[PDB]
Design a protein around this ligand. Structure first.
Ligand SMILES: Cc1cc2c3c(c1C)C(C)(C)CC=[N+]3c1c([nH]c(=O)[nH]c1=O)N2C[C@H](O)[C@H](O)[C@H](O)COP(=O)(O)O
Ligand SMILES: Cc1cc2c3c(c1C)C(C)(C)CC=[N+]3c1c([nH]c(=O)[nH]c1=O)N2C[C@H](O)[C@H](O)[C@H](O)COP(=O)(O)O
Ligand SMILES: O=C(O)/C(F)=C/c1ccccc1
Ligand SMILES: O=C(O)/C(F)=C/c1ccccc1
Ligand SMILES: [K+]
Ligand SMILES: [K+]
Ligand SMILES: [K+]
Ligand SMILES: [K+]
Ligand SMILES: [Mn+2]
Ligand SMILES: [Mn+2]
Lengths: 500, 500
């Protein structure tokens, strides 16, 4: 099976890429696996595969850390993401995001049901497993539980059967047969949970599949539209129908090659302690436990020599940055274009802790609009901050065509030099806020409302007659022939490789 | 003479440090010298010494580019600045700024007058020189003149004789015997010019000395207080009285080892076209010429084989960042402390294009103040933005004790995650603004007023009971013994030098 369609093949691909370190000596899931992975993520090192996890039994489980994190070299910086999607390992972020958006104006390719797959190689009924006995990691020293679920896909379906959602949401072990996790608005797992609660008749049928097809975990992390079944979007994106197998205890369908599957129910009535957790913005607030959603696990199925992927998330750079931020930015780009806004590109700078999105404007189109900063900022902010794709993002930075939004240094330059504080900004207090940002949920104002801004880093003539400056840089401040002379004589004179 | 006391010795020091490239083949001052220097500054390469400048004659002049720019290695990143001050080349920014502040609670050490020095080796009277015939550089292709003055020190004295100011302000060749340049409020050259204009009797006696003692050019770039003679501050800082020689045509005194000295007058009445110039924020606005101050040159004296220092300023990183920003931040730190504010450290992040200053707060002291964000931001902003040391700075970011303000990544993390847009900020519209920032002088509002902000990145409990989080990072999320184990086993497991 190809790497983008099968997690076990993905792991092979990382090895072949010389992007994997296999650790075959015993490693403790209590902090050690996650500490190694954290260091990987902070240094852009090779992904760790923990083949000898203390507490591994019944063949459950090995751990792969840092599945979607960055590589050290510039040339293949996003290679691990490219391997989720069948792209060359040198693919740019623009190419990765374009691939993730490609299915948005394609017919879905619905999944294909097959009778069995690797995920059925082993099973444990409700008399045979205990979640508290598995080698579930403690990821950060102050976490309120062992977070089994950091890179699996929750599967829930609307009561009417017409929408099956795949998404990542954290979850931790509660007891032998339950998890607790975050199920919050406006996320699709929450939206579907609310449909079942209003019906009021039963708990939500649920499955959680770990080690799914890489292209599927990417869509799981992207805010594709309400009512759109991720499986068909992934089928369109990859050009192939995904192969799914029915759960044993319910009628949901999971990827045939899933490493590990939990089957059970998400309660419409019960809750339990959840958190705290060391989160995407870089913090944990020890002791901040709150009631979360409660999942009951009835069955486990798994591959021989099952591998659990893990995100050791926090400060830069991990899956919460590379995937949450970039994939939200991609959806925002599309949203803007569909609302007739002249946006060419979007990206969530890592320097902003993925709380900003920079929007590159086609300023020729802007000029034809014959508008102003105040009007245009309001328009952009209303479109984005009133939509679910904008949920995680608190600052939008508008930039002109000279800025490469995928380069944080250039975004920070433009923000700092082209957007006058206050005057060139519009604050939004009556929009949904992201409570996980510390200044929201642990800040001075309402956790769930406001705190958003549109920062206009377009200069005045960009709305009227065109750019009226040149950069004071090597590229723009010197003629072509001179630049080339300097470059050609560089090492000859005494001054100091792409791949590396 | 020591390197910090003599520019010619400084150049030797750079050579000895393997931080200099001598270019002995012909180089054009029309753009080529500056293009090479620009590339140096964008790549943190060795400083270029142009020993064979096209148009060099009467022994005027060689060029040293990038005198105060960064070195590539982390260990000696600020080494060129350390060489201005007799510090080890590994000195930290905190140590450099502490050295520059050290004279602020010392008695001045006034200069010593000597009868002659190297700067008198050669002279040209007003029948013998033509500024338009010298190898003055065109620094950026769109500049409105040849900017002779990018790293010399203007010397003017109050009419009463009691304050002699040394400062850097740009100037370009106007004609054979005049320059034009920026003389703007609240700068000391402007303040002294205004004193002479109110007296109304004569033009201001002036000298411009290039290739001055490095410790003197650093003080020249720092906003030490009104009425304080830089020469005595530099004497206190270095522990030695500076040796000065009288000008030939006026009674001002210049450093004995200055490379090149211009003597003449700054007009109290005349102006001439000045600019545009590719400036510290990274831009030039072609064609934006405005009237500037006009200097008349009566005499030139110079060393044998004179060397003119040059800043090829613009996008990161050059003297306008390393010196303007850092030295303003140092003075702001002191100002805050003198106003009883609990500030330990200050720095202007390069990522902000040195338009921000991050202020590290002693949060124990803050807690004892029993104050709030709104009150404290207003206090800090009133102190800083009402003072000349705050002139260039448009955003202040308050951070707690866990943040190293000298590390831009950590400042950006704290800003993005701890300061709620709008609510945690205070805008200042009734303060002096810095017109050179593009969003000011080429923006949507008044060029000279407002556009400033205090951004509070202190979290709520930092004002009350203390920090209530831990970072989700390797350092803070794992116990000591574990961290050390991981580090000790790092390369053994398969994962990847200080000086480099
Ligand atoms: C990549 C990724 C996405 C996480 C995520 C993580 C990762 C690794 C974790 C597990 C390490 C930490 C927590 N995360 C949550 C999360 N969304 C959410 O609602 N709760 C979560 O607890 N997300 C983001 C969520 O996957 C995206 O917002 C999707 O758009 C949700 O899909 P949906 O649009 O179908 O609702
Ligand atoms: C290091 C440095 C400082 C420049 C400077 C440059 C450099 C290299 C240039 C020459 C490349 C570009 C322009 N600069 C000007 C400038 N200040 C000013 O008033 N006009 C200028 O044109 N400054 C900043 C000025 O030196 C500091 O604000 C001082 O505090 C001024 O001294 P004062 O406090 O005695 O007035
Ligand atoms: O648990 C977290 O660190 C996390 F990022 C949650 C989240 C992300 C995006 C949307 C919603 C919740
Ligand atoms: O010419 C310039 O690029 C410049 F930075 C001028 C300046 C700097 C600080 C204070 C005043 C003017
Ligand atoms: K999704
Ligand atoms: K603007
Ligand atoms: K000065
Ligand atoms: K705050
Ligand atoms: Mn969805
Ligand atoms: Mn001064």
């Amino acid at each position: 099976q190809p790497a983008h369609l099968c997690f076990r093949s993905f792991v092979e691909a990382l090895k072949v890429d010389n992007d994997l370190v296999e650790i075959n000596t015993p490693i403790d899931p209590n902090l050690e696996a996650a500490a190694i992975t954290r260091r990987v993520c902070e240094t852009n090192d090779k992904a760790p595969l923990f083949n000898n996890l203390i507490g591994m039994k019944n063949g459950l489980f090995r751990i792969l850390g840092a599945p979607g994190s960055l590589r050290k070299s510039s040339a293949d910086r996003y290679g691990r993401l490219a391997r989720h999607l069948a792209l060359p390992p040198t693919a740019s972020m623009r190419e990765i995001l374009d691939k993730m958006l490609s299915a948005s104006d394609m017919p879905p390719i619905p999944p294909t049901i097959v009778p069995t797959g690797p995920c059925k190689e082993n099973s444990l009924d409700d008399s045979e497993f205990d979640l508290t006995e598995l080698p579930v990691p403690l990821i950060h020293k102050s976490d309120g539980g062992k977070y089994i679920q950091t890179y699996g896909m929750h599967i829930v379906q609307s009561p009417d059967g017409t929408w099956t959602n795949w998404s990542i949401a954290r979850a931790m072990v509660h007891d032998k047969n339950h998890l607790t996790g975050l199920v919050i608005p406006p996320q699709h797992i929450w939206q579907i949970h609310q449909m079942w609660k209003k019906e009021g008749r039963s708990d939500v049928p649920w499955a959680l599949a770990f080690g799914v097809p890489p292209a599927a975990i990417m869509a799981s992390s992207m805010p594709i539209p309400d009512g759109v079944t991720e499986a068909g979007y992934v089928g369109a994106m990859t050009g192939s129908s995904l192969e799914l197998v029915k759960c044993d205890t319910n009628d949901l369908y999971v990827p045939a090659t899933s490493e590990i599957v939990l089957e059970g129910t998400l309660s419409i009535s019960e809750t339990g302690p959840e958190g705290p957790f060391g989160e995407m913005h870089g913090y944990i607030f020890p002791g901040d436990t709150h009631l979360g959603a409660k999942y009951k696990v009835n069955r486990i199925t798994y591959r021989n020599n099952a591998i659990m992927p893990m995100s050791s998330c926090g400060r830069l750079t991990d899956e919460t940055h590379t995937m949450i931020g970039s994939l939200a930015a991609a959806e925002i780009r599309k949203l803007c274009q569909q609302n007739d806004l002249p946006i060419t590109d979007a990206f969530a700078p890592f320097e902003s802790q993925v709380t900003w999105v920079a929007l590159r404007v086609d300023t020729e189109k802007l000029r034809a609009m014959k508008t102003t900063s105040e009007g245009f900022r309001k328009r952009v902010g209303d479109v984005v901050f009133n939509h679910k794709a904008g949920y995680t993002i608190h600052r939008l930075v508008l930039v002109g065509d000279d800025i490469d939004v995928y380069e944080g240094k250039d975004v920070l330059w433009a923000f700092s030099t082209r957007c006058r504080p206050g005057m060139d900004e519009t604050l939004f207090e009556d929009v949904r806020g992201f409570p996980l940002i510390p200044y929201m949920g642990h800040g001075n104002g309402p956790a769930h409302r406001g705190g958003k801004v549109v920062s206009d880093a377009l200069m005045p003539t960009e709305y009227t007659t065109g750019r009226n400056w040149e950069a004071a840089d090597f590229n723009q401040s010197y003629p072509e022939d001179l630049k080339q002379k300097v470059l050609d004589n560089w090492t000859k004179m005494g001054f100091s490789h792409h791949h590396h």
